[PDB]
Amino acid sequence: MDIDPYKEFGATVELLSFLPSDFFPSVRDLLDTASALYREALESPEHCSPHHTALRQAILCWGELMTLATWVGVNLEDPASRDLVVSYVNTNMGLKFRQLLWFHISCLTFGRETVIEYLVSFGVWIRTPPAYRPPNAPILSTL
Amino acid sequence: MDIDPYKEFGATVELLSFLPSDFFPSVRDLLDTASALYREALESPEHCSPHHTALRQAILCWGELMTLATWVGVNLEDPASRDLVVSYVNTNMGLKFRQLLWFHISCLTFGRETVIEYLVSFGVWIRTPPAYRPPNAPILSTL
Amino acid sequence: MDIDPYKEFGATVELLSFLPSDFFPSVRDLLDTASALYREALESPEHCSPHHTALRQAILCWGELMTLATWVGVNLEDPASRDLVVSYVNTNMGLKFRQLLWFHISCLTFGRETVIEYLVSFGVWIRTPPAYRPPNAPILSTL
Amino acid sequence: MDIDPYKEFGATVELLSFLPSDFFPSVRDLLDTASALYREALESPEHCSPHHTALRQAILCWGELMTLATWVGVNLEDPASRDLVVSYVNTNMGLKFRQLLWFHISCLTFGRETVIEYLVSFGVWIRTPPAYRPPNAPILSTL
Numbered sequence A, B, C, D: 001m002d003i004d005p006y007k008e009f010g011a012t013v014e015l016l017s018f019l020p021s022d023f024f025p026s027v028r029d030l031l032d033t034a035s036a037l038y039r040e041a042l043e044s045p046e047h048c049s050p051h052h053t054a055l056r057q058a059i060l061c062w063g064e065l066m067t068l069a070t071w072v073g074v075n076l077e078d079p080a081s082r083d084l085v086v087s088y089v090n091t092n093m094g095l096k097f098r099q100l101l102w103f104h105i106s107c108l109t110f111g112r113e114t115v116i117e118y119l120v121s122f123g124v125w126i127r128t129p130p131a132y133r134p135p136n137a138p139i140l141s142t143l
């Protein structure tokens, strides 16, 4: 069905399309950030928040995809297809996964209002042509 | 990390493997049920329930897996590897996905207490000898 | 030392001497039932109950016996004696293990009074000849 | 289930590994002690103590193992396999059995605090180099 994984929280794929695809940190970086800030809450038997309830499932999906990639690499004796599949995973599913991880980790760390205002402001910045684009882009911070 | 997709809901993979893998309905049946009964809520911008959140994320993951399988069927030439990947997906990931969808739908419908009692009773039943167990398999009913 | 493992609990080998060998689930089934229902309590540092203590000790005994059977299969080169010892172990020791595990699990699940009354009634039933006893044995179930 | 038979009593397999394997007395000696000191309590119909429960179960297991050994000696004819099985049973299984019997008897007789302090002191001793290791090895006493 047509499910948006953000409108449950107050955003949309059209609002996160302000951020380009080359903007999102790597999956390793984001998973390390999660392990750092919310490992004890993701490994807890509590609905601490919908962000947790969703981030757990996203991490489980990524883990299943990694198991798929290993299984492919070990079973399939066709390096061409092996590489094709692994690259497709790590690129497309990686992009989607890190979009979702960015959104959740940010709305947890900083806040819904702050994150939405940041998306709007970054859209302003990235629509503004370069000749009039300040260099001090918007950068989420607690400082 | 060490995340259990059930322990925030009060269960565990050890408790759901207590049932056979040949018991859980097909993914198509479970998705049709989910649509029929909770489309207006899964397509809603509300934290209706942790079950709704987790189920949205699971459905998104299954959609991405289906896209992967279709992309494989299109691009990958080697039919052996292609069919092998598709079969692995639909079998392993299918089993996990339908276990989780069964859990979530059944909870939303009947109750967590009911579903856990059903897991326990059905496991004990299918493990008990027939001459000393009730002859008709347990089943969940709102009727 | 003339010990009865059930006298401490209110039963006797003479009360469970009627339950046939086909009345008890397999050892794997009973161990799975235990791991599903009371794993977090058997792996706990608490004197949760005498049933938990006895279950722990019985499971350790069975683990050591399975270790013995494996060591036999690995270190004995006479298949006759090897299979004979493994068969003795499984059949006899697992019959006793099934008796004990069943008693403990059923007590924990239903109740001491319930289980003792069920044993009395099953004895009444199994002592009666088939020409005068009902064909459907008594049944203990949460359903 | 990965169960530690001392966790519910306040110890661990790594706290008892301070004690060597050549430290624990013969199973005959330990069973003689157990008889002399707690026969009427082990044969009793009471949850006198979790120690008594575990001791009853351990004694039942040792009895079943002795029965296995006699059955082997009488049925099996291959002297190699017969002696191998009996020797493995005695050495290994009785080593574990006398570990557990020592723990339970000692706790019942002296005290939990006393036994734990004895384990740590014996660790101190067996770790201390010989040139500074007093010959008066630690020993349990009620005096």
Ligand SMILES: COCCOCCOCCOc1ccc(C(C)(C)CC(C)(C)C)cc1
Pocket: A005, A013, A057, A058, A061, A062, A091, A092, A093, A094, A095, A096, A097, A099, A100, B057, B060, B061, B062, B064
């Ligand atoms: C290739 O990237 C396209 C960029 O546009 C993204 C549009 O989709 C929005 C995000 O959608 C999803 C879909 C699925 C997922 C899940 C949770 C299933 C994770 C995944 C992709 C790792 C399987 C996350 C986000």
Ligand SMILES: COCCOCCOCCOc1ccc(C(C)(C)CC(C)(C)C)cc1
Pocket: A057, A060, A061, A064, B005, B013, B058, B061, B062, B065, B091, B092, B093, B094, B095, B096, B097, B100
């Ligand atoms: C072949 O599977 C054997 C049984 O697996 C038991 C569960 O394994 C632990 C992880 O379980 C899940 C369950 C569901 C899922 C989701 C919902 C994310 C869907 C899936 C399987 C399509 C990735 C992921 C992991």
Ligand SMILES: COCCOCCOCCOc1ccc(C(C)(C)CC(C)(C)C)cc1
Pocket: C005, C013, C057, C058, C061, C062, C091, C092, C093, C094, C095, C096, C097, C099, C100, D057, D060, D061, D062, D064
């Ligand atoms: C062959 O079995 C016949 C049925 O048993 C008749 C006597 O029943 C008494 C059962 O006594 C025991 C003895 C030992 C045990 C332990 C706990 C030691 C377990 C075992 C048999 C797995 C070693 C349990 C019950």
Ligand SMILES: COCCOCCOCCOc1ccc(C(C)(C)CC(C)(C)C)cc1
Pocket: C057, C060, C061, C064, D005, D013, D057, D058, D061, D062, D065, D091, D092, D093, D094, D095, D096, D097, D098, D099, D100, D101
């Ligand atoms: C070969 O022994 C090696 C040393 O043992 C290390 C600790 O092992 C953990 C399990 O310990 C026990 C101890 C006793 C027992 C009982 C009492 C059940 C008796 C036995 C060994 C006869 C089965 C079971 C497991």
